[PDB]
């Protein structure tokens, strides 16, 4: 275990004031630090905490080359799409995870943070796309989608749609329509010296 004194900046990932839209998710790279996971898998503040390829209770003694934290906001019902092998509007057009994904998906209800009475339409997702995304691919184009046989030429109209839609987030929504803050921790080990190790 290399002699690393810096601790991994998980705090500023989970306790951020602003999260990115799912169509434009934000990736933060974690490296050259000691990763203490005992503050995450023992936290009751999370509604979802699933790990793939690794047990979260045996994650605190392993060394990785990199850890990537992908953060975004989606509605409750769509949280199930943040998993390997899944399909749907989010899984296919916004945020795709590979079938061999290794890491942990953490999510919590943020109804009292990301909603307002008048409706918080700041968060958006992609509804229309010509094809599905590759694993960890990001697409933030705002070009007009041609649904019909005729050219749109950047003009909205019949069979010409703007690809991004907003979430109608309101404090009075049912749980499935309440906002959830999602952080996906993607782990990798390469044929290289590790830079992220547990507290030992």
């Amino acid at each position, epitope marked *: 275990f290399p002699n690393i004194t810096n601790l991994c*900046p998980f*705090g500023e990932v989970f*306790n*951020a*004031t602003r999260f990115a839209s799912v169509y434009a998710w934000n990736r933060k790279r974690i490296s050259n630090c000691v990763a203490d996971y005992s503050v995450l898998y023992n936290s009751a503040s999370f509604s979802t905490f699933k790990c793939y390829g690794v047990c979260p209770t045996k994650l605190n003694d392993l060394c990785f080359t990199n850890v990537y934290a992908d953060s975004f906001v989606i509605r409750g019902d769509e949280v199930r799409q943040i998993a390997p092998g899944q399909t749907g509007k989010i899984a296919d057009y916004n945020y795709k995870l590979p079938d061999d994904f290794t890491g942990c998906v953490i999510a919590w209800n943020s109804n009292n*943070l990301d909603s307002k009475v008048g409706g918080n339409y700041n968060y958006r997702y992609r509804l229309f796309r010509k094809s599905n995304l590759k694993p960890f691919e990001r697409d933030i184009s705002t070009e007009i989608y041609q649904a019909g046989s005729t050219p749109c030429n950047g003009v909205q109209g019949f069979n010409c749609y703007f690809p991004l839609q907003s979430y109608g987030f309101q404090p009075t929504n049912g749980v499935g329509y309440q906002p959830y803050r999602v952080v996906v921790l993607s782990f990798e080990l390469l044929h290289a010296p590790a830079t992220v190790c547990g507290p030992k």
Partner: antibody, heavy 127, light 104 residues
């Protein structure tokens, strides 16, 4: 227990400069930034600036830009704040506080506040 | 985002409930506002962060909430030690403090 301590009171002439230290312990130093807040006698709190103990990035209040320089020593876990060109109206207590309003590594806004404050260093400016 | 507080001085007896207001000239994110308490001769301490979340070590009698441009600090009952100057802070834009309210 997290503790922040500072230097004793100082007396300066107008046009002089003061460098106030801030020794911190009881936590991972490079996980939290440091903020400085000034309070003149009988007045409220005025934000001076913020520094990252990890990468040295700073964020200064406009009123103090060009006057205040902040540095950090991570080997002695001590912060410093230097205020140049002291004026007669800079007489105040200067507080050092641990920061959780901006990330130390990525520089993004956090849900929090200046959790742990120091004792306050009194600086008097007079001819 | 200029913050103002009211009343300047809040005169209440021990055992009474105290309401302290903070208003913003612009909308302030509900997660970017905090309240501080400063006792005479002492440095300020954090009471509430994220508008409504109680800081560690703070008694349960201290609570608060708010949104938009109107935030409130609530003290369910004033103890002998709750007579101090309170400040509101926001860091949605830069970082600013309100004028401060004295409880007497």
């Amino acid at each position: 227990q997290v503790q922040l301590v500072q230097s004793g009171a100082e007396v300066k002439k107008p046009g002089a400069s003061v460098k106030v230290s801030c020794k911190a312990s009881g936590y991972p130093f490079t996980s939290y930034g440091i903020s400085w807040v000034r309070q003149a006698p009988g007045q409220g709190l005025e934000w001076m600036g913020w520094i990252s103990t990890y990468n040295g990035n700073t964020n200064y209040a406009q009123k103090f830009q060009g006057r205040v320089t902040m540095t950090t020593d991570t080997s002695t876990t001590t912060g410093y704040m230097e205020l140049r060109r002291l004026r007669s109206d800079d007489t105040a207590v200067y507080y050092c506080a641990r920061d959780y309003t901006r990330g130390a590594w990525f520089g993004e806004s956090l849900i929090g506040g200046f959790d742990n404050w120091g004792q306050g260093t009194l600086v008097t400016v007079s001819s | 985002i200029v913050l103002t507080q009211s009343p300047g001085t809040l005169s209440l007896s021990p055992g009474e409930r105290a309401t302290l207001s903070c208003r913003a000239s612009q909308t302030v994110s509900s997660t970017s506002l905090a309240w501080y308490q400063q006792k005479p001769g002492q440095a300020p301490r954090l009471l509430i962060y994220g508008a409504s979340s109680r800081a560690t070590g703070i008694p349960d009698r201290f609570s608060g909430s708010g949104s938009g441009t109107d935030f409130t600090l609530t003290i369910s009952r004033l103890e002998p030690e709750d007579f101090a100057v309170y400040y509101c802070q926001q860091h949605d834009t830069s970082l600013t403090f309100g004028g401060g309210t004295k409880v007497e």
